[PDB]
Amino acid sequence: HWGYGKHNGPEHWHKDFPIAKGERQSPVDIDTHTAKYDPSLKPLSVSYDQATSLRILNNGHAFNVEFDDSQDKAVLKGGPLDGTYRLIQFHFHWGSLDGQGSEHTVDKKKYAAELHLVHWNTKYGDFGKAVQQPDGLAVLGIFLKVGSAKPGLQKVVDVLDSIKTKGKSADFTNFDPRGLLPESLDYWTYPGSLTTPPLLECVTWIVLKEPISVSSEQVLKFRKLNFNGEGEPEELMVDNWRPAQPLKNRQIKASFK
Ligand SMILES: CCCCCCNC(=O)c1ccc(S(N)(=O)=O)cc1
Numbered sequence: 357h358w359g360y361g362k363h364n365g366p367e368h369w370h371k372d373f374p375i376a377k378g379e380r381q382s383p384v385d386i387d388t389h390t391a392k393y394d395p396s397l398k399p400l401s402v403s404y405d406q407a408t409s410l411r412i413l414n415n416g417h418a419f420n421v422e423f424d425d426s427q428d429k430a431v432l433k434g435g436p437l438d439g440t441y442r443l444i445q446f447h448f449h450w451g452s453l454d455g456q457g458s459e460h461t462v463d464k465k466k467y468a469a470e471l472h473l474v475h476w477n478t479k480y481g482d483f484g485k486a487v488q489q490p491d492g493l494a495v496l497g498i499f500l501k502v503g504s505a506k507p508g509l510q511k512v513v514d515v516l517d518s519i520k521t522k523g524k525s526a527d528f529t530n531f532d533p534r535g536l537l538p539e540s541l542d543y544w545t546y547p548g549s550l551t552t553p554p555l556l557e558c559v560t561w562i563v564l565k566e567p568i569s570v571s572s573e574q575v576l577k578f579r580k581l582n583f584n585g586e587g588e589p590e591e592l593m594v595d596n597w598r599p600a601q602p603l604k605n606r607q608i609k610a611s612f613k
């Protein structure tokens with residue numbers, strides 16, 4: 357099955373998931389000079405005061421911090437979106453070295469990592485139905501650069517030792533995702549897809565302009581995770597990012613001037 361190695365990596369995904377070559381794939385390069393300021397975009401509304409984290413899971417491609425999405429606790433609204441999108445999980449993509457790891461790029465620049473806060477449109481009733489719809493998901497993407505530590509990330513990095521291998525999970529309650537946000541909510545937006553199989557074309561992407569800073573030590577601990585299961589030959593979980601895909605007939609809009 358699919359992964360990030362030579363033999364099962366992004367260049368192979370199209371054979372099981374033909375939509376890999378579709379018309380609205382993600383990630384993309386954000387060309388800052390071509391993205392047009394759209395004065396009709398609203399401020400995003402990130403309402404995470406009542407967020408309820410439950411568990412952290414190594415799923416063999418990344419680790420997901422999962423939320424209680426059984427009612428409207430943590431939601432994303434506004435910006436390019438109509439309606440209410442419930443936070444279900446967040447995860448990251450990162451590199452083997454600081455010079456690569458993000459999925460989106462900004463004028464071809466790759467960041468050390470990228471955080472994805474994944475939300476589903478509650479008008480579809482459940483996540484499985486939402487991913488079948490062109491406006492089913494909203495993913496808030498946040499770049500990570502290496503510099504100063506991010507205090508709000510430390511609880512995540514401290515639990516990684518306990519979910520080293522694929523299929524391990526740990527209790528992860530009372531985590532506040534507001535501690536992973538940058539100061540500004542200025543963003544770019546475009547229609548796209550999940551960036552892992554099944555690559556469904558169901559996502560309104562909202563990518564924040566301001567990266568967060570994390571420390572070298574913090575990102576080093578991401579790279580000690582394993583793609584493999586317990587007792588299997590060790591394959592460090594690094595470079596779990598899909599490269600930029602063709603923009604095709606899409607426009608990336610800026611919320612800021
Ligand atoms: C029930 C539907 C299963 C969909 C497969 C599970 N995959 C996801 O739910 C999913 C979420 C976010 C992204 S991303 N990297 O674009 O933020 C990618 C994949």
Ligand SMILES: [Zn+2]
Binds near residue numbers: 447448449472551
């Ligand atoms: Zn992702």
